Structures are given as structure tokens and as C-alpha cells.
Amino acid sequence: MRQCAIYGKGGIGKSTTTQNLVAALAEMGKKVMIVGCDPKADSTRLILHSKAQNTIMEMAAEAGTVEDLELEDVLKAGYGGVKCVESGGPEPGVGCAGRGVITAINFLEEEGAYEDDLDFVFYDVLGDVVCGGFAMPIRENKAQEIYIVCSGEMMAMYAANNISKGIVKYANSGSVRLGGLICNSRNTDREDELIIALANKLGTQMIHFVPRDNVVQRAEIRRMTVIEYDPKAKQADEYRALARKVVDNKLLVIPNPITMDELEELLMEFGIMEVEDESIVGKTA
Amino acid sequence: MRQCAIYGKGGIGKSTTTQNLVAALAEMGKKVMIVGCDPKADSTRLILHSKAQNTIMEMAAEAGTVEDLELEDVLKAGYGGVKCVESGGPEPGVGCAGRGVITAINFLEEEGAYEDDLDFVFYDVLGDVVCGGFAMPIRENKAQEIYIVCSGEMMAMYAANNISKGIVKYANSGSVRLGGLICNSRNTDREDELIIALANKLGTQMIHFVPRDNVVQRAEIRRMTVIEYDPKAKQADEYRALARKVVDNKLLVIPNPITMDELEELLMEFGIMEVEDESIVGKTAEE
Numbered sequence: 001m002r003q004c005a006i007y008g009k010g011g012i013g014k015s016t017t018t019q020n021l022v023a024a025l026a027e028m029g030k031k032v033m034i035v036g037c038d039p040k041a042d043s044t045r046l047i048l049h050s051k052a053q054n055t056i057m058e059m060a061a062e063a064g065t066v067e068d069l070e071l072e073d074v075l076k077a078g079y080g081g082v083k084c085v086e087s088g089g090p091e092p093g094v095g096c097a098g099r100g101v102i103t104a105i106n107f108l109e110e111e112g113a114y115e116d117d118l119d120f121v122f123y124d125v126l127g128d129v130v131c132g133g134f135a136m137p138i139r140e141n142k143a144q145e146i147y148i149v150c151s152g153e154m155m156a157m158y159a160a161n162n163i164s165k166g167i168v169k170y171a172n173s174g175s176v177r178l179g180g181l182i183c184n185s186r187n188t189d190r191e192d193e194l195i196i197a198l199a200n201k202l203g204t205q206m207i208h209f210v211p212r213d214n215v216v217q218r219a220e221i222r223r224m225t226v227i228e229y230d231p232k233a234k235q236a237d238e239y240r241a242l243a244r245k246v247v248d249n250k251l252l253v254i255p256n257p258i259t260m261d262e263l264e265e266l267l268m269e270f271g272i273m274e275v276e277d278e279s280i281v282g283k284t285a
Numbered sequence: 286m287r288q289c290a291i292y293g294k295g296g297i298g299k300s301t302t303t304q305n306l307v308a309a310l311a312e313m314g315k316k317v318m319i320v321g322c323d324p325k326a327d328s329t330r331l332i333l334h335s336k337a338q339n340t341i342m343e344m345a346a347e348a349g350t351v352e353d354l355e356l357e358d359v360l361k362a363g364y365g366g367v368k369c370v371e372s373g374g375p376e377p378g379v380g381c382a383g384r385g386v387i388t389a390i391n392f393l394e395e396e397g398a399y400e401d402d403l404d405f406v407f408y409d410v411l412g413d414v415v416c417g418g419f420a421m422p423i424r425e426n427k428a429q430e431i432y433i434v435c436s437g438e439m440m441a442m443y444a445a446n447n448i449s450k451g452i453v454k455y456a457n458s459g460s461v462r463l464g465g466l467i468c469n470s471r472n473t474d475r476e477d478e479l480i481i482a483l484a485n486k487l488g489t490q491m492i493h494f495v496p497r498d499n500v501v502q503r504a505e506i507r508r509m510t511v512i513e514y515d516p517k518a519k520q521a522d523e524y525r526a527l528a529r530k531v532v533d534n535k536l537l538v539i540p541n542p543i544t545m546d547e548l549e550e551l552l553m554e555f556g557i558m559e560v561e562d563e564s565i566v567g568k569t570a571e572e
């Protein structure tokens with residue numbers, strides 16, 4: 001069983017890419033489980049055709065304690081037999097993402113959910129502020145092959161750099177490694193070139209460039225993946241290509257994070273960021 | 286001294302509005318301090334015309350402990366005499382954002398940064414995932430008046446609701462209260478009506494609607510607020526109006542958070558989100 005995680009910031013389609021990748025793996029005959037660890041996204045909605053899946057945190061509070069929770073109420077099967085679980089985001093004002101994911105993983109391990117025919121587990125993790133809590137899957141050596149979803153924009157690339165810093169922090173134990181960057185296109189010129197250049201500086205690869213295509217939203221509105229909604233679409237073949245490359249990937253590395261100066265240099269080289277006129281700084285009109 | 290915090294999610298102009306509001310208060314004769322508590326934004330760059338202000342976390346790490354730091358190296362003055370500090374985000378992979386923010390605030394107190402002549406302190410806090418960490422300024426009673434920057438978009442309004450739930454969590458034990466919503470316009474139709482409706486459901490008010498105007502960008506490129514770059518511009522009057530309403534505000538409430546169904550209902554009612562056709566859910570193209 002390969003223990004994987006998809007990390008990335010919010011608002012760039014990370015969870016839609018994760019679920020479409022997972023659907024492509026199931027189509028290939030792989031047994032997969034998704035464990036949602038992103039308080040800002042529905043990590044399983046497209047596999048289950050659901051509005052919202054009951055979370056481990058919510059159900060544990062409904063049954064009093066996680067000790068009296070039944071696996072059947074938290075683990076659901078959807079398209080292609082993919083098994084789906086949601087951890088539950090932190091209780092507002094009180095919770096910590098690190099505590100929630102420890103609780104979910106310990107529960108699934110005690111109930112034998114990882115023992116199956118399982119070929120892959122994917123943790124879908126919010127990777128923006130890479131604090132100790134959201135890095136808990138790394139610290140606990142559960143997210144062993146990490147793929148970072150990003151886009152050719154400053155905040156998404158900054159997040160990729162901070163996720164890489166988190167991987168570096170734990171390099172002296174366990175075996176957590178970076179497997180590559182996935183570029184979720186935003187229809188920006190030279191975006192593919194930019195993420196390839198970032199991957200090169202980080203010491204990894206851009207494993208796939210995911211195009212923007214209206215069929216993604218046509219499937220999302222029906223609460224499904226493209227693989228299920230229209231397996232003949234061009235975009236379905238894009239997710240199949242990504243899935244094949246993930247299955248076959250042996251290029252797992254400890255990355256080399258960059259400085260903010262180096263990041264700004266990349267954004268300028270590829271036309272995203274304009275040069276700063278230091279001569280007008282502080283000058284009124 | 287009034288202890289305020291601005292909470293809201295990233296990517297919607299929160300720190301730009303905070304600094305322009307603070308600059309308007311300084312122009313009004315108020316002595317203000319900004320304490321930056323957002324890992325993802327720069328809360329002081331437009332007050333200092335700076336590319337980046339050295340943070341307490343980074344300087345403490347170089348010096349060894351926060352006990353080795355001098356206030357003169359972390360607290361800098363900029364436009365209108367506004368004093369600026371940056372807490373610094375968590376060390377990636379290990380740190381907690383809240384523990385760093387509380388370490389920073391305690392250092393400022395012990396070194397007398399809250400001078401008896403200060404009119405306002407504003408904490409600029411990331412309010413998206415409102416975990417225990419980013420609620421630590423609320424739990425530790427460091428900010429009494431919370432203002433939420435939002436916009437007429439699902440994720441920003443979800444963040445506003447989460448911030449409100451964090452406030453409720455500590456209301457029976459402390460004095461923290463919600464003072465209002467500030468709408469950062471995104472040129473979306475009926476956006477002001479949407480935030481007026483949300484504020485009413487939560488029990489608060491829309492304290493101001495901040496329009497979008499190219500003059501904000503023209504000042505930003507020079508690392509400046511609009512108040513300093515062009516105090517005659519119309520947008521400069523919006524920040525002054527916002528500053529006046531904050532000074533005069535007396536509505537400080539325990540909010541009433543809404544459910545996600547009620548939030549989607551608001552978004553569908555005001556044209557942001559379409560009605561969902563249940564009949565096509567789960568139906569393949571072949572069907």
C-alpha cells in the first residue's frame with residue numbers, strides 16, 4: 001500500500017484534481033481510500049455524489065466519544081469502489097488540525113481500514129499555512145509520497161515552498177518525500193514553464209499540467225468526476241495520464257526550498273510580476 | 286486605549302484596508318499601533334514603505350530567545366507616527382501561529398510598547414480556518430473589538446461565519462465582542478445587499494462598504510496607503526468615513542452564527558450562486 005498526500009492552498013481546485021485523479025486510479029483497477037484533511041473543501045463530494053459527508057469529529061461528538069464510533073458511519077464507498085472518510089476541520093476557536101488528523105488516523109487504524117486490498121491512500125491536506133497542525137501527516141510519517149497542487153501565482157507557489165520546508169524539517173526520521181508538482185492551470189501564459197522552473201529549483205518535477213476545461217465544471221455541478229461523467233472527454237485522458245505517472249513514479253526527493261527573492265525572480269522571468277520602480281516608492285502624487 | 290482586531294480570510298484585500306483605515310485614524314489625530322498576526326500577508330508595508338519588516342519570530346530565532354530582543358529592533362514608526370510590529374508566522378512544519386502571536390504580544394507588553402498615550406491597537410489576524418491558534422488573541426483577551434473584513438463570495442462569508450463562531454466560544458467567559466463587518470468590494474452585483482443581509486442575520490452591522498478603485502493599486506505599487514499618496518482622491522474619503530464609524534461605534538455584540546444551508550440560501554437569494562438541479566446529480570453524459 002502506498003501512503004500518499006495531496007497538499008496545496010485553497011481556491012485553486014486542489015480537491016477537484018485529487019478526486020479526479022483518484023477516480024482514474026479506480027478506473028485502472030486500483031483500490032483507493034481518500035481521507036479528507038482540508039477544513040475548507042469537500043474532499044469526497046465528487047466520489048459520493050454527496051452534499052457533505054459526515055465527519056469523524058462530528059460523529060464522534062454525536063456518539064459521545066470516538067470510542068463508541070462505528071466504522072460504517074464514517075467510511076463510505078462511492079465511484080469505482082473508492083472509500084471516503086472526512087476527518088472534520090477544527091472546532092472553531094478551539095481545535096487544532098494536528099489533533100484532528102491524529103484522531104482520524106488512529107481510529108481508522110484501530111478499525112482495520114488500512115488493512116484491505118488497498119493499493120493507495122490519499123490524504124487531501126490544506127497546505128497554505130504549514131503550521132505544525134497541518135504538517136501532522138508529515139510528522140507522523142503517514143503522508144509518505146507528497147504531491148503539491150499549485151498554479152502559476154505567487155500565493156500558490158509560496159505555499160508549495162512552505163510545504164517543501166515542512167518536508168525538509170522531518171527528513172531525519174520516517175520517509176516522507178516530495179513526488180512532484182501538479183499544475184492546475186489558470187489559463188495564464190507561460191504557466192507550465194513557470195512551474196517547471198519552480199520544480200527544477202526545488203529539486204523535483206512537474207509531474208502533470210492539468211488543463212482548464214468546461215467539462216470539469218459540468219461534472220462538478222452534478223457532484224461527479226469527469227472520469228465518471230464523461231469517460232470519452234479529452235480531460236478524462238488528462239487525469240488518466242496523471243494517474244499513470246503517479247503509479248509509475250520513482251522520483252521521490254527531499255526538496256530544496258527557495259528564498260522569497262528567488263521566487264520573485266521566477267515570477268518576473270515568466271511575466272507574472274512586473275519590475276519594481278524603486279524610484280517612486282514613497283512618492284506622493 | 287481600545288484594543289481591536291481585524292479578522293478575515295486572505296486574498297481579499299484585508300491588510301490593505303487595515304492599513305488605509307489606520308492611516309486615516311492617524312490623520313485624524315489618533316495614536317495607533319498595528320500588530321501583524323497574519324502569516325500570509327504584510328500588515329505594515331504600506332505604513333513603512335517597506336518591502337518587508339523584520340518579524341519578532343525571525344529576530345528571536347537569530348538572537349536566540351525573545352528575551353534577547355530590544356524593542357527598538359521590532360517596533361518601527363511610519364506614516365502619521367503609526368507604530369508597526371510583525372509577529373511572524375509559524376516556522377513551517379513545527380510552529381503554531383497562535384503560540385507565536387502570544388509570545389509576540391507578551392514581549393510587547395513587558396517592554397512597555399502599549400504606552401499610556403495610545404488610542405488604538407489593531408491586530409491584523411488571519412481569519413479563515415479559525416483554529417485555537419488563530420483564536421488565541423480572543424481567548425487571551427488581547428482584543429476586545431473584532432471587525433471582520435469580508436466580501437460577497439462563499440469562502441469569505443464562510444470565514445466570517447467561522448470567526449463569529451470563535452467569538453461565541455469565548456463570550457460567556459470574556460469581554461470580546463463583534464463590532465461589525467467591513468465589505469471589501471469585488472465589483473460583484475448586489476454585494477453590499479448581501480453583506481447587509483449577512484450582518485443582520487449575525488446580529489451585527491455592515492460598518493462600511495469599501496469600493497474598488499484603481500487609486501488603491503497606484504498607491505500600493507509605491508508601498509503606500511491612499512491617505513498618504515493622494516489624500517484628495519475620492520477613495521481617501523471612504524477610508525476616512527470608515528475610520529469615523531469605528532471611532533464612534535457602540536454596537537458590540539455576541540454574534541449569532543448561521544448554518545451552511547442558511548449561507549447558501551443567502552448566496553442564492555442575491556444571485557451569487559445558482560440553484561442546484563437535483564435531477565442531474567450523479568447522471569452521466571450517457572444518461
Ligand code: SF4
Nearest residue numbers: 096131133381416418
Ligand atoms: S498548530 Fe496550526 S492548526 Fe493547530 S492550533 Fe496552531 S495554528 Fe491552528
